[PDB]
Amino acid sequence: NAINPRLTPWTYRNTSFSSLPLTGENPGAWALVRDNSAKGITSQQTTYDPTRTEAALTASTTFALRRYDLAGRALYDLDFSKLNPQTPTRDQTGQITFNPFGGFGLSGAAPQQWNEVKNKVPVEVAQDPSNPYRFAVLLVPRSVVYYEQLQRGLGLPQQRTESGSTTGAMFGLKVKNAEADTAKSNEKLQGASGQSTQRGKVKALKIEVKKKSDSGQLQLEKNDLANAPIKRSEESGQSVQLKADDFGTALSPTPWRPWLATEQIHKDLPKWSASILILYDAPYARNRTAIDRVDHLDPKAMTANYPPSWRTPKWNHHGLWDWKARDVLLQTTGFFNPRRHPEWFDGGQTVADNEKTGFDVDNSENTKQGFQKEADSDKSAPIALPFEAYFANIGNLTWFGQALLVFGGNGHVTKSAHTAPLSIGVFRVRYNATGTSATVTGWPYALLFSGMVNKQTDGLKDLPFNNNRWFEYVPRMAVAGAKFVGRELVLAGTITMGDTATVPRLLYDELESNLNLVAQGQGLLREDLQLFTPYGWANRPDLPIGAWSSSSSSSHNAPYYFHNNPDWQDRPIQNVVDAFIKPWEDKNGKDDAKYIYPYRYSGMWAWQVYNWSNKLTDQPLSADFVNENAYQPNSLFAAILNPELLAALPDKVKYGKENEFAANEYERFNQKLTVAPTQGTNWSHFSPTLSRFSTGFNLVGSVLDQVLDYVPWIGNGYRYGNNHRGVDDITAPRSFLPTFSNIGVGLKANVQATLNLQLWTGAGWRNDKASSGQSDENHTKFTSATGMDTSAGNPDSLKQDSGDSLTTQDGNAIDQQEATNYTNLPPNLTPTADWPNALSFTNKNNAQRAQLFLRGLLGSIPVLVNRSGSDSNKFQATDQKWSYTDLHSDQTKLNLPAYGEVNGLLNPALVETYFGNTRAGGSGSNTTSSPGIGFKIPEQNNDSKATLITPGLAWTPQDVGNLVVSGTTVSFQLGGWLVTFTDFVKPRAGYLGLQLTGLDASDATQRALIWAPRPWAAFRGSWVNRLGRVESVWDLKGVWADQAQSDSQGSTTTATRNALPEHPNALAFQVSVVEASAYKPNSTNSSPYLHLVKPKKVTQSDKLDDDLKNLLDPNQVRTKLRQSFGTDHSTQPQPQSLKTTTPVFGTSSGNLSSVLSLSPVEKVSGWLVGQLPTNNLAPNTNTGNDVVGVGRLSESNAAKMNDDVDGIVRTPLAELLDGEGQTADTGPQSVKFKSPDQIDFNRLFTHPVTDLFDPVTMLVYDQYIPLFIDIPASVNPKMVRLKVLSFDTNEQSLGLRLEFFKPDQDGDFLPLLTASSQGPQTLFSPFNQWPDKHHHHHH
């Protein structure tokens, strides 16, 4: 009873693995099989004990590995729970005892630690490339397979309000402006005090850190970085503070905790770890099976190699000033705080606060703070590897030599709607030469990717991938796989970049006016995208609390610390630098002091990110700033890795003292960014692992914006560009303004201005009209921008400092004759701003673009709205204008928020892609079919109470399929897009670098999948077909079942209960409030975007209306959009599965050479505009495909199938959906081995065995082939060969395999399965016989 007919194929979600096709010497397939009708783990709810759950699962579920032959016929099952395996014997050289007929030599004994690991279930197989009969089998506990049935979600912090006390906070956000501590007024930093009013030796801020030369050691005498004249505020006696208690007590609000702690898995490795067993397999042999050993992937093998700083992730190398500055601003402290990342903490949310950092943060003496501690009580929670994060890292086996590598999976195995468990590193099982012993290790990706520099990529530069000696950047992946492309090892999937969203730091008294940024910094709002709320930012985020106040008790502490405004910045001319920087510059390394220059700094999004994010440079381990780490994967990622180094690297990482944070504040002050790896360490030996990397396209940022506009939004098929004709559109002096491009938007201005370049302003222009009344200036005068016409242009009341300047002069022998500020400023500082000539005024940036691209494919880019689309609060097409004639006269008709939206895009353009208010409001057939959702500029004295929302698609950045290879390209399914890296392994000049094939929303079946509440639950894997096209299969039974049951039928739970649904893209967004007066302009400048948009401080009364807060439940938006598509004329019986195939792309597809042969951004724009061809769904005409390489599936490439799919069995000759269908042919059936008695005795058995075959080729000589086999005259003898499997000169036996030819023209030679009743092989004997008396001829 070899085949258990109760078991059928299945697909492991973490890797998309169902079967492994086997070619070569031991062909056919291995397939995952299980009892697909078992319920698994079996709304009031209950808590499931792991031990009991696993035991219940062992008794109620059945799993096996099913062996298939080359034709696709099932041979036998290996159910490890019922198998009685034996270890194979070896010979004197340590090689496995093996004969192709007898099989493996068996020892009579089961493997060591067998009966404790036998109940684990197989979820992957990888064939040893150096032994076709050897396989690595990955086994996991049954509980891991059914983990999603436990419904262990992550919850919100308990709120003492609701909105939608006071402050208008939603979803438990703690927000209150910080206040001046009157008892710590002396702790204000002091300058160097008279004449010159705009600056402060002569005028810098002094910071001193000095130790006692008297009375471990040190204990400190003075620590100016401990100073805090500003503190958190009180609410009902107690001070407003982040507490792990906010999530409830562990045993209604329950904190999220891992199902099993790291130590619980470690202490019961046979029961709870993932294990690699070594299996021997030979389906045509007598002893067909043997199991050598089992090796456990102990999570502690990985944690033992974690950088030492990971024991203390609430701390960073900036130490006390940074802990204090973040804590006072109601942010999380350190580089990997448990409030943002509870998945990697054994305590989960029970340790989610800024307390117990492993360093003194609250001593009664300031000079005792910043000290590293021992004890057992106040010791930190370390980055660990608990149940969910550990099993996220289990999958994708890759062999290289004697090393078996485990890269991890996409994290779907243990994911929850609001958690993001991912792969933190790579495990390795390194076997010795004979396979009698092995060693197990894990190394984090932080350590493996530690040599990253800009020149390693052909795509986006300056991306937040840089690191430092402290390993503050923690890259984590949703892994597609690790595949060999020729000899090159390619690792790909999605990755978490360093945090950029919370790099700008708000002024201590600006928190209550900027709730979204506070929420992102707090760990509440799990949004990695940069949001556009700059008015309240501090001019720079790297100043200590001592620099925030001033003994002069004026509006903040300008020029040092003030409201960020690039219009107020000092120009770096020789005299400005000489006066304010140079008298302090060469003193920062003397008598224990550091200085904050009286130089006025400021800049927009690209500038904040350039200076204080972990941007890649040309030098590795050079990130002086690693703000934090992303909540979720937020970039496409592919890396070429050195496999020889992976195979050879040591098991135990030896870190140095250079990797540890300083033991006190004195040593930290006198720290050096780059420090030499110390003697006896090996951590630096891991930096050469990664040789090259990709983030998708091979384009510069501003060119990628053009391509992003060409991409359709998978939700309805409309492009982010809204079919904008670029330079040939009517948005400059069928179509709408684009989301990402500035080309043909606003005016093309001849620039130089600040410090010829023909550049487009984009939407949100603020150009001065000029003293003529006709031609609009190519800039904004500093006069127009900074005037008091409380004031957004100058809230801190700064003043202007040979034609004389504007008084308040300084030192030197020149004293001034030129103003410190610039006179001509760029005419755009809104989110669409892209100034290559001015980093200080640019908002678009590569760190954002890499995210916008990934989110653009998933369809989850947030959109800012203030109209719910309900009858009364509807957005109408009459509310929106786009033509340059309409916009030059009145730019508020554009509905550009320039506050609250996603940075680096045009929000009303995005509103239009999603909701189509303009296009739907332009036809009789439907008429107001649009959901009526949008953002309208507030009128009169009315306020706009806006929120970011997602359109309701449920695709996540962990929706990553298996990695497939085709020529020199690699592909994987990312959400509803099949992504192919055409220019990574072998990059070609002038090629875009990616191919994109998406699901088609115009087809009802594909639309049902695109809009499914669990769309990734449908994925059944990709594979490359014989023609090199990528095929993907989708199961639709779950789509139809989920569509048949609506939980949110008329739900208003988000609006009334201040809670989020279990939708994967439900985010804790906050209200963004702007008064109509902010959109009123000012002297020849009538632009509503002249000043930075000044928001309103949020109070209880500034809450969203219920119908708008209800759109924060993404199913409510989804309901509105599906009503708009609304069509059910179904001919039935409804497709149950779908097979998609990538189209054939031409030789010139993606090639820009013909347009790159007008700036490059302008040429790319025109090329894309030339590739452009009412309704709520865009029709698929197929124009948007070939030439570009970006498009939606044609009808012919999307095959609807009548039955559902759980697993797929593939051999080199057959593809069997659920292991069923037509079985392939290995030959003609008429070609077969002769029976011994039918052989011409004198012509064949008379020879000794060694005469009959070439020992070099191991083939029977052509002259002897017809004597062994029956071959009809119609069949060519060259197509048949006899491979020698065995020979024995003692017994004169000869073991042969009959092989038949296929395509190259003499796969190639394949085993002829129908050769004999038993298969393709047979033993012939005895040879070396004395002659008989002629073979009879009767026929």
Numbering used by the authors: 60 to 101, 106 to 227, 231 to 258, 269 to 276, 283 to 297, 301 to 336, 349 to 830, 848 to 869, ...
Give the text the authors published on this PDB structure.
This P1 construct, empirically chosen after many crystallization attempts, excludes the predicted N-end of the signal secretion peptide (spanning residue Met1 to Leu59 according to the structural properties prediction program Psipred26). In this construct are also excluded the (predicted) transmembrane and intracellular regions at the C-end of P1 (residues Tyr1522 to Ala1627). The structure of P1 consists of a large N-terminal domain, with Asn60 as the first residue visible in the X-ray and the cryo-EM maps, and a smaller C-terminal domain (residues Gly1395–Asp1521). The N-terminal domain of P1 has a β-sheet propeller topology of seven consecutive blades or β-sheets, each with four antiparallel strands, except for β-sheet VII that contains only two strands. The longest intra and inter β-sheet connections cluster together creating a crown-like structure on one side of the β-propeller opposite to the position where the C-terminal domain is located. In the crown there are 13 disordered loops, spanning 117 residues, which could not be built.
P1, together with the P40/P90 polypeptides, forms a transmembrane complex called the “Nap”. In the present work, we report the structures of M. pneumoniae proteins P1 and P40/P90 and of complexes of P40/P90 bound to sialylated oligosaccharides. The structural results reveal that P1 (1627 residues) and P40/P90 (1218 residues) present a similar overall organization and topology in the extracellular regions.
